[PDB]
Amino acid sequence: APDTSVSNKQNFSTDVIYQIFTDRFSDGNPANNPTGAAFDGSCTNLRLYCGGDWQGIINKINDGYLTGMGITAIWISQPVENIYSVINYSGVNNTAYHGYWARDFKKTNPAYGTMQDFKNLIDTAHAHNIKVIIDFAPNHTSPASSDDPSFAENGRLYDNGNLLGGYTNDTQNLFHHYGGTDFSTIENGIYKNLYDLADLNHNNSSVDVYLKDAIKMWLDLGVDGIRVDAVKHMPFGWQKSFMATINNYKPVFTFGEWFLGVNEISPEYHQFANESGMSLLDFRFAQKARQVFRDNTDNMYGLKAMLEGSEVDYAQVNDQVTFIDNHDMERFHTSNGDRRKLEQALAFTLTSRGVPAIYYGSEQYMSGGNDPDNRARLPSFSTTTTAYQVIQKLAPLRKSNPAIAYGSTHERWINNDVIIYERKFGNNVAVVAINRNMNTPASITGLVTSLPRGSYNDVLGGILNGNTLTVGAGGAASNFTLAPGGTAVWQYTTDATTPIIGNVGPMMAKPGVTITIDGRGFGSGKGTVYFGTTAVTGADIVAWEDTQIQVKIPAVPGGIYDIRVANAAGAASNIYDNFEVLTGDQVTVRFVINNATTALGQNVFLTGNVSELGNWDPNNAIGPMYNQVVYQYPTWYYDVSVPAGQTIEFKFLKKQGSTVTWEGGANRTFTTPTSGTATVNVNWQP
Ligand SMILES: [Ca+2]
Numbered sequence: 018a019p020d021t022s023v024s025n026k027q028n029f030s031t032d033v034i035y036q037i038f039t040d041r042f043s044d045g046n047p048a049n050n051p052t053g054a055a056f057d058g059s060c061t062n063l064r065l066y067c068g069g070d071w072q073g074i075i076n077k078i079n080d081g082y083l084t085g086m087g088i089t090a091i092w093i094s095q096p097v098e099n100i101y102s103v104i105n106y107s108g109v110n111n112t113a114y115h116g117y118w119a120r121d122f123k124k125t126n127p128a129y130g131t132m133q134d135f136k137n138l139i140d141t142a143h144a145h146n147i148k149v150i151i152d153f154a155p156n157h158t159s160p161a162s163s164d165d166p167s168f169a170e171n172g173r174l175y176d177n178g179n180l181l182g183g184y185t186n187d188t189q190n191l192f193h194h195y196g197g198t199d200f201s202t203i204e205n206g207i208y209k210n211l212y213d214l215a216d217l218n219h220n221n222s223s224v225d226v227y228l229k230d231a232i233k234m235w236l237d238l239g240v241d242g243i244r245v246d247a248v249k250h251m252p253f254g255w256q257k258s259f260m261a262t263i264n265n266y267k268p269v270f271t272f273g274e275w276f277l278g279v280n281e282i283s284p285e286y287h288q289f290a291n292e293s294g295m296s297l298l299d300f301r302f303a304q305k306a307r308q309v310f311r312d313n314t315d316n317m318y319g320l321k322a323m324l325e326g327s328e329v330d331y332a333q334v335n336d337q338v339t340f341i342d343n344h345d346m347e348r349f350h351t352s353n354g355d356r357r358k359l360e361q362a363l364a365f366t367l368t369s370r371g372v373p374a375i376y377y378g379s380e381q382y383m384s385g386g387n388d389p390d391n392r393a394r395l396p397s398f399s400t401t402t403t404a405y406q407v408i409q410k411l412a413p414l415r416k417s418n419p420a421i422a423y424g425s426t427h428e429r430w431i432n433n434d435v436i437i438y439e440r441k442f443g444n445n446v447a448v449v450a451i452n453r454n455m456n457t458p459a460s461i462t463g464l465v466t467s468l469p470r471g472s473y474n475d476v477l478g479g480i481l482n483g484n485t486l487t488v489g490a491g492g493a494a495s496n497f498t499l500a501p502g503g504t505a506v507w508q509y510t511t512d513a514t515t516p517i518i519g520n521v522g523p524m525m526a527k528p529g530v531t532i533t534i535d536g537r538g539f540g541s542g543k544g545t546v547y548f549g550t551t552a553v554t555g556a557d558i559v560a561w562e563d564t565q566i567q568v569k570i571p572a573v574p575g576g577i578y579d580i581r582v583a584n585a586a587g588a589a590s591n592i593y594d595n596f597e598v599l600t601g602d603q604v605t606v607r608f609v610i611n612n613a614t615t616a617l618g619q620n621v622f623l624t625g626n627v628s629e630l631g632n633w634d635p636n637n638a639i640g641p642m643y644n645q646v647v648y649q650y651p652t653w654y655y656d657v658s659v660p661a662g663q664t665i666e667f668k669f670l671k672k673q674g675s676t677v678t679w680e681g682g683a684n685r686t687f688t689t690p691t692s693g694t695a696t697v698n699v700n701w702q703p
């Protein structure tokens with residue numbers, strides 16, 4: 018199938034995502050509405066149910082509202098059954114309108130609909146070439162007080178109707194009982210409760226297997242992507258086994274939310290997007306975009322440096338989901354704000370690298386501060402606002418122009434308030450000019466592009482004051498003035514003759530799993546896929562066409578591989594690095610080591626004889642290990658995804674910068690479980 022087909026569940030760079038809060042978009046069935054103190058039909062109390070549902074989203078796919086905007090994927094609230102309590106927090110009644118307070122991950126939330134309504138939503142969406150991404154929030158169930166079992170539903174977890182346990186009297190240890198996080202350390206934020214949410218214990222084999230079976234069920238119902246909630250608050254080693262369960266079963270695009278603030282650059286966040294097996298909501302793009310286009314706390318050089326930096330720091334930048342606002346920040350449009358600011362920032366996101374997401378109601382200029390004010394019911398379904406038209410004109414280009422879906426980004430002209438950049442993929446080009454200054458024209462002189470000669474019409478049709486670009490020989494354009502608030506997009510598309518890889522998905526899996534490689538120039542006759550120097554040809558290539566190849570990972574040792582494609586004529590592509598072949602299926606094992614005293618700046622690490630453990634190299638060792646909450650220093654602990662069903666060898670080591678101190682003695686051995694979890698508890702061997 019082509020890279021742009023709705024069936025391509027692995028990669029989303031050719032798509033535009035519309036993020037819907039199901040309750041707040043359209044009540045297409047009022048008989049499923051909550052009643053009593055849980056419902057506010059006027060949606061004036063933004064913490065109660067207003068009544069919006071899956072039949073409401075079906076109705077807006079059918080009548081052309083969402084397809085007339087060119088949206089090709091929708092991201093909806095978590096579909097699973099939630100607690101039914103109305104919780105009063107210091108006066109206000111609050112409900113699970115948002116889907117985050119789960120009680121059964123194997124059944125639907127009846128306010129949104131029945132399982133038949135969920136299947137009709139998947140079928141209607143796909144029949145209209147729309148992909149469906151759902152929230153999944155495995156870090157917790159719901160508000161709970163072990164001291165007061167009558168509060169809310171006491172964090173109870175059920176499995177397809179059957180009660181597994183509650184937060185009070187948790188003799189099975191399904192949940193963590195360490196108090197609540199103060200956010201001071203990454204460790205602290207993982208093992209203590211978020212606010213009052215009953216924190217799931219993924220080291221318990223029952224919780225582990227349950228969540229892994231729950232996600233597979235939703236995969237069986239045809240969802241196309243997963244947005245994972247609170248990834249900074251779950252063990253990284255457990256999320257790696259969770260991604261390995263998705264990818265080795267039915268790989269679909271998965272991305273998580275790790276909030277970053279303005280000017281926060283964090284190593285940990287990038288490490289997560291590069292090594293977890295999932296991508297991130299690109300808060301580094303969003304905060305810088307709001308600084309330049311909304312708040313004017315930085316200018317175009319900031320924007321340039323963020324685009325140039327992020328292409329390097331994210332190993333797979335075409336997989337990060339970009340946005341200018343969402344459910345966790347104030348709406349981009351303000352009361353006293355110019356609409357042009359929103360319209361430009363949206364045209365910027367739609368032509369930028371990554372996977373653009375548009376928060377519902379952006380096309381209707383909704384304002385509102387933080388939660389719950391940014392989740393009002395959307396006021397109108399007008400298809401004639403300037404913003405609806407911008408999206409309508411630009412969102413198609415992700416499907417037709419591979420330079421917008423996969424291309425590199427190149428700054429071509431810049432000053433404090435204008436950036437003109439080029440997106441380039443083989444021979445396909447898109448050039449975008451933006452003047453953020455609303456009252457001063459910009460004189461453009463000396464702009465060189467990669468567009469061939471011709472008079473390129475603005476794809477926006479002049480609605481944000483864009484102009485035609487005349488390009489002469491050598492990509493040089495005639496000089497022009499960019500209007501106050503001017504935004505124009507110019508484009509040229511043709512064939513590549515060369516193989517060029519734009520995206521690969523999944524990026525982590527065991528031998529035998531079919532991966533999807535997307536790009537242009539592969540040709541129609543089946544060529545060769547290289548993993549390292551290993552060549553895969555013939556029957557192991559499941560599908561070959563010019564924009565997409567599906568191929569089985571070969572039986573190679575586990576580790577990090579470079580992918581390359583050769584067309585049938587022997588021409589080879591660019592290298593798509595950092596693919597992780599796993600040793601096999603994964604299980605999370607908790608490693609606990611006692612009596613490992615260290616010095617300031619010295620920390621404990623784990624390594625061993627499989628790739629998942631860094632194959633005995635100190636620079637790739639797992640850690641630094643934790644030592645505050647579940648166990649305390651000098652006992653250190655860590656949850657590590659390791660291959661299932663086999664004997665591994667390993668040793669612990671101390672690292673103070675440059676210096677590595679290995680444990681003495683023989684190597685440790687452990688035979689891993691086939692499913693579930695296990696705990697290794699050993700003592701530092703001098
Ligand atoms: Ca309803």
Ligand SMILES: [Ca+2]
Binds near residue numbers: 206216
């Ligand atoms: Ca947690």
